Scaffold this active site. Structure first.
Site, short mmCIF file in Angstrom:
data_model
loop_
_atom_site.label_atom_id
_atom_site.label_comp_id
_atom_site.label_asym_id
_atom_site.label_seq_id
_atom_site.Cartn_x
_atom_site.Cartn_y
_atom_site.Cartn_z
CG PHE A 9 -4.54 -2.22 -1.95
CD1 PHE A 9 -5.60 -1.34 -1.74
CD2 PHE A 9 -4.85 -3.56 -2.21
CE1 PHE A 9 -6.92 -1.77 -1.79
CE2 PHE A 9 -6.18 -4.01 -2.25
CZ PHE A 9 -7.21 -3.09 -2.05
CD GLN A 37 -2.89 1.02 2.42
OE1 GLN A 37 -3.19 -0.10 2.84
NE2 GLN A 37 -3.46 2.13 2.88
CG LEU A 97 -9.97 -6.47 0.17
CD1 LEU A 97 -8.56 -6.02 -0.20
CD2 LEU A 97 -10.43 -5.76 1.43
#
Ligand SMILES: [Cl-]
Length: 164
Positions: free
Chosen positions: A112, A62, A121
């Site tokens: 990221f 990230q 996610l």
């Protein structure tokens, strides 16, 4: 066609090489445009000189907090934050490029690069591109992370920009 952009990355002041990213402007034009412009620096700010501040092996690397360098900051080309454009692209595997956020509609500049499939996610983070070249560099970055996300080397985007 879709933009190609690059990040040149150092670890502890010596170059690792280049990560090249394709931005899916056909699918997520607003999200792709933000990242593209932050790579060129054309608005007067962007990723040049900033860091990968949070790196977790077997998860993701990230970056993008070019204001506070710690996960609290960043801003988009539109304003401080902007909406989730769509969730059409999925976190399918290593090399996925996706927006970090702090809840719905809090995209700024943090992003990221996944080093594994991160399906949980999907529907929460906007995927907007993928690694074309330089997964070796991503694996080096990943190797300098830790379970807590703290990096063991200073990982800096020395240069960045647009290839096409
Ligand atoms: Cl070049």
């Amino acid at each position: 066609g879709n933009p190609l952009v690059y990040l040149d990355v150092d670890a502890n002041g010596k170059p690792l090489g280049r990560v090249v990213l394709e931005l899916k402007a056909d699918v997520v034009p607003k999200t792709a445009e933000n990242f593209r412009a932050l790579c060129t620096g054309e608005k007067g700010f962007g990723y040049k000189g900033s860091t990968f501040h949070r790196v977790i092996p077997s998860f993701m690397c990230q970056a993008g907090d070019f204001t506070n360098h710690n996960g609290t900051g960043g801003k988009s080309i539109y304003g401080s934050r902007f909406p989730d454009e769509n969730f059409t692209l999925k976190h399918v595997g290593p090399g996925v490029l996706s927006m970090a956020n702090a809840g719905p509609n809090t995209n700024g500049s943090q992003f990221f690069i996944c080093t594994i499939k991160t399906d949980w996610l999907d529907g929460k983070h906007v995927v907007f591109g993928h690694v074309i070249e330089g997964m070796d560099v991503v694996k080096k970055i990943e190797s300098f992370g830790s379970k807590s996300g703290r990096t063991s080397k200073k990982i800096v985007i020395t240069d960045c920009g647009q290839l096409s």
